Design an enzyme around this catalytic site. Structure first.
Site, PDB file in Angstrom:
ATOM      1  N   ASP A  68       0.844  -1.177   0.000  1.00  0.00           N
ATOM      2  CA  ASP A  68       0.000   0.000   0.000  1.00  0.00           C
ATOM      3  C   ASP A  68       0.879   1.226   0.000  1.00  0.00           C
ATOM      4  OD1 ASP A  68      -2.253   1.654   0.107  1.00  0.00           O
ATOM      5  OD2 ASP A  68      -2.437   1.530   2.268  1.00  0.00           O
ATOM      6  N   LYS A  69       0.298   2.365  -0.356  1.00  0.00           N
ATOM      7  CA  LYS A  69       1.010   3.635  -0.385  1.00  0.00           C
ATOM      8  C   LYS A  69       0.250   4.667   0.449  1.00  0.00           C
ATOM      9  CE  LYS A  69       0.668   7.815  -2.624  1.00  0.00           C
ATOM     10  NZ  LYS A  69      -0.532   8.589  -2.987  1.00  0.00           N
ATOM     11  N   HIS A  70       0.951   5.707   0.864  1.00  0.00           N
ATOM     12  CA  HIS A  70       0.348   6.776   1.638  1.00  0.00           C
ATOM     13  C   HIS A  70       1.059   8.070   1.245  1.00  0.00           C
ATOM     14  CE1 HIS A  70      -1.611   8.927   4.835  1.00  0.00           C
ATOM     15  NE2 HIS A  70      -0.446   9.322   5.314  1.00  0.00           N
ATOM     16  N   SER A  71       0.382   9.199   1.409  1.00  0.00           N
ATOM     17  CA  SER A  71       0.975  10.475   1.055  1.00  0.00           C
ATOM     18  C   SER A  71       0.678  11.472   2.145  1.00  0.00           C
ATOM     19  CB  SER A  71       0.367  10.952  -0.262  1.00  0.00           C
ATOM     20  OG  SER A  71       0.660  12.315  -0.505  1.00  0.00           O
TER      21      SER A  71
ATOM     22  N   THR B  51      -8.460  11.688  -1.199  1.00  0.00           N
ATOM     23  CA  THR B  51      -8.844  10.650  -2.141  1.00  0.00           C
ATOM     24  C   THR B  51     -10.277  10.160  -1.992  1.00  0.00           C
ATOM     25  OG1 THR B  51      -6.576   9.917  -2.393  1.00  0.00           O
ATOM     26  CG2 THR B  51      -8.298   8.304  -2.896  1.00  0.00           C
TER      27      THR B  51
ATOM     28  N   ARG C  71      -4.402  16.798  20.157  1.00  0.00           N
ATOM     29  CA  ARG C  71      -3.242  17.572  19.755  1.00  0.00           C
ATOM     30  C   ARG C  71      -3.551  18.598  18.680  1.00  0.00           C
ATOM     31  NH1 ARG C  71       0.367  15.487  16.120  1.00  0.00           N
ATOM     32  NH2 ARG C  71      -0.306  13.622  14.967  1.00  0.00           N
TER      33      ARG C  71
ATOM     34  N   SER D 250       0.677   8.557  13.960  1.00  0.00           N
ATOM     35  CA  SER D 250      -0.678   8.617  13.422  1.00  0.00           C
ATOM     36  C   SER D 250      -0.685   7.957  12.061  1.00  0.00           C
ATOM     37  CB  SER D 250      -1.141  10.067  13.279  1.00  0.00           C
ATOM     38  OG  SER D 250      -0.822  10.822  14.437  1.00  0.00           O
TER      39      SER D 250
ATOM     40  N   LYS E 204      -2.378   3.763  11.317  1.00  0.00           N
ATOM     41  CA  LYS E 204      -3.397   3.407  10.335  1.00  0.00           C
ATOM     42  C   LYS E 204      -2.883   2.446   9.279  1.00  0.00           C
ATOM     43  CE  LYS E 204      -4.902   8.241  10.651  1.00  0.00           C
ATOM     44  NZ  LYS E 204      -3.552   8.812  10.898  1.00  0.00           N
ATOM     45  N   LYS E 205      -1.739   2.762   8.667  1.00  0.00           N
ATOM     46  CA  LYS E 205      -1.175   1.915   7.608  1.00  0.00           C
ATOM     47  C   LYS E 205      -0.749   0.530   8.079  1.00  0.00           C
ATOM     48  CE  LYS E 205      -1.659   3.514   4.370  1.00  0.00           C
ATOM     49  NZ  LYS E 205      -2.979   3.798   3.725  1.00  0.00           N
TER      50      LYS E 205
END
Lengths: 440, 440
Positions: A83-86, A123, A171, A186, A190-191
């Site tokens: 998977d990818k995240h940005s 997204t 926060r 954080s 999730k990932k």
């Protein structure tokens, strides 16, 4: 340990917390035994004292475990779960192509994405422009799609990294968001919770980025790489440019069209293609789908050229309750804006720089983003045909094409667009799309 | 300013807050618009960055104003409105004599005292041992007593320095209590709120003290003196010894008897007399009731010798709904403990040191203090005839006389008393009761 005050105090005095204490605190946050005031204090302490690698990993691991963690062994998917995240930006529609491409190459992507935060787009919001698209399938349904299609883009559930909701929320109003240790947690809570084998991070750099300078971007990128690998997930990260809209459009439906057109070969923004290809290459390698970088690029180019990637995208859209003929009739489903007029510069010259954050905020204000959670978004508004840095502008070349819902909406957006793009007489020095790769 | 996050952030980045921002924040705390998480963060920021004198004064002033502030001009009391405060200790019954003495000398004392915190005892609790004593008269009643008797010792109302309740409560569970700037503010928010002209601080030093070392005591003493004077209240402070019980008893009713006996001349512990006289001298001077220190001592000694001080005490007790013949029949009203037996050392020698905190905790456990707000106190339990440092102990001289409510209660308390008092062969070096005076 078992006392919040003592743990807040230990860290307050510059002492490094133990796994047992972190676990305790986080479990307490989730269990609601730890108060908001106590989440604020520890966070402010982690800000002033940062955290060592071992405690950073403890935090992420702890947050990840405070809820459900997906397991893909039951399905026996003989292919990597990647998977990818940005860190987000404007015109960052990479996930809509990256997903199908990588999936077409034998990978499996349980992408649990998100919504637009501040100036950046989300997204999930773009995808919800597709009539009938469901970002919340039941776990049993999610599994089926991932098994049959290979990719699914869903929203986060309450069961995913629960502690983080309470934590971030706090926060967010206590001035403790800008902290590499906590940010990293954080993101990874999730990932990692997706039960991944490999992961690639897209850490933006620039005026449209989250982190203020290249150093902070590089740092965050490194924190994430170390910690993600520390938790057992093959992770690599790339510093990408966000000093101007990545794709040629910015919005929700406008960006979905661009993805389809990209996937169909009608049009491919060069920078977006670079960044998208790069992130995919990393995924094919880490996922062991390809060993050589050139082998990764070859396979990906192949899925783009033969239409496999586009096909997987349509199968995904359908699988998530969207139209059965979307990549074919996307125009028949995607909402069009009332008013579509181009905006031109007050003078001629070259686009030397653009405040991408400002452009991000301009779409939000047009109604394409949320200033508050309760806000409804207009999936039709947005920018199209964005001018790129180095582009010579004149009356035969607009700064962008604005899709507004009414004249007043257009006028205001146009004002913002003209004020965020700075023109020069001489062409600016070309900056790289992909700055660097990072791994441990 | 008008944004909590921004203000928390400004201070977080080492920037000194403006009066307008402090006022805003505090008003917000009182108004309930500022959240617990936000009170915790700022507090943790003030911890890590401390505060300048101007912002320290802003905080105290702001907290003081978040509620009611007494005004004594209406009564036209041609005499100073003075008061004393202490950081607390064990056997610190000074207020019960100091009040009447100073009042007998022409002063006016609207003493808004408190209850026992942790190991230290609370004047209000001691006074509530007196059958019918009311620590919460209506403001109109309070004024009458202060006008007629000259002194009254009442408990704090919700209307007094409201912001502080919310604030302390939060920092109490967030590890942000030990902070000179904030401590100083809580203390002064309440005292200044009494509309004083002069104030004297009793900052304890030692094992029974609040602040860990002599330096921290000295520092706190100075912070308070500067800020209290900065707010326009003639303030002076004395560093007092709390390395052993100040009075000869420790408890509630036991300490009230000792006060009466002190006031009546039957018995006067030498150290308690020193500290008590000292604080009063400061009050007579600051209040301008006496110019010369020797003139202060002379007047005070006079009220003690002629019985005026004792008389004012009885008038106060009566005025606050207590017995009309208390200083005469105090024995008929004050509850006596079931079991009263002396505890002796396991060996002979000199008392070289005693963990006063431990002794404080021993009374709480006996039931003479609260480990939690909901706790009921036994006004009869306590220690009497406390051995002093330098005292030679043997079977004809007990460490203390324990007033317990039952054998098991006695046995346990005795164990604690024996373990907190360290014996030596040679007599210890005598430490001063009053270390130093501080003023600006």
């Amino acid at each position: 340990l078992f006392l919040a005050q003592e743990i807040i105090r230990k860290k307050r005095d510059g002492h490094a917390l133990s796994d047992e204490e972190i676990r305790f605190f986080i479990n307490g946050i989730r269990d609601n035994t730890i108060s908001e005031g106590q989440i604020a204090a520890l966070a402010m302490t982690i800000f002033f004292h940062d955290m060592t690698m071992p405690e950073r990993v403890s935090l992420t691991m702890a947050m990840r475990d405070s809820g459900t963690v997906l397991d893909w062994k039951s399905l026996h998917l003989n292919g990597p779960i990647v998977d990818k995240h940005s860190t987000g930006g404007v015109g960052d529609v990479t996930s809509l192509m990256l997903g199908p491409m990588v999936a077409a190459c034998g990978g499996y992507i349980p992408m649990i994405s998100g919504r637009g935060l501040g100036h950046t787009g989300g997204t999930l919001d773009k995808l919800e422009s597709i009539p009938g698209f469901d970002i919340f399938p039941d776990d049993n349904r999610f599994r089926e799609i991932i098994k049959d299609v290979g990719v699914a883009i869903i929203g986060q559930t309450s069961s995913l990294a629960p502690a983080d909701k309470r934590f971030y929320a706090t926060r967010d109003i206590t001035a403790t968001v800008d902290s590499i240790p906590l940010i990293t947690a954080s993101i990874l809570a999730k990932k990692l919770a997706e039960g991944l084998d490999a992961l690639v991070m897209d850490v933006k750099v620039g005026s449209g980025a989250f982190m203020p300078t290249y150093e902070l971007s590089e740092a965050l990128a490194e924190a994430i790489v170390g910690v993600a690998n520390g938790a057992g997930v093959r992770t690599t990260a790339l510093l990408t440019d966000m000093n101007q809209v990545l794709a040629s459009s910015a919005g929700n439906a406008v960006e979905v069209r661009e993805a389809v057109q990209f996937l169909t070969g009608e049009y491919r923004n060069p920078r977006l293609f670079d960044v998208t290809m790069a992130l995919c290459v990393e995924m094919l390698i880490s996922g062991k789908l390809a060993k050589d970088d050139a082998e990764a690029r070859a396979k990906l180019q192949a899925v783009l050229d033969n239409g496999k990637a586009a096909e997987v995208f349509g199968r995904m859209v359908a699988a998530q309750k969207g139209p059965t003929d979307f990549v074919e009739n996307y125009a028949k489903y995607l909402p069009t804006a009332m008013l579509t007029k181009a905006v031109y510069a007050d003078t001629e010259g070259f686009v030397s720089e653009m405040d991408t954050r400002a452009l991000g905020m301009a779409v939000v204000a047009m109604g394409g983003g949320r200033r508050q959670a309760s806000d409804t978004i207009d999936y039709s508004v947005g920018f199209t045909d964005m001018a790129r840095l180095g582009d010579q502008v004149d009356g035969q070349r607009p700064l962008a094409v604005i899709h507004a819902k009414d004249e007043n909406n257009w006028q205001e957006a146009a004002k913002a667009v003209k004020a965020a793009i700075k023109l020069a007489d001489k062409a600016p020095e070309s900056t790289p799309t992909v700055y660097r790769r990072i791994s441990e």
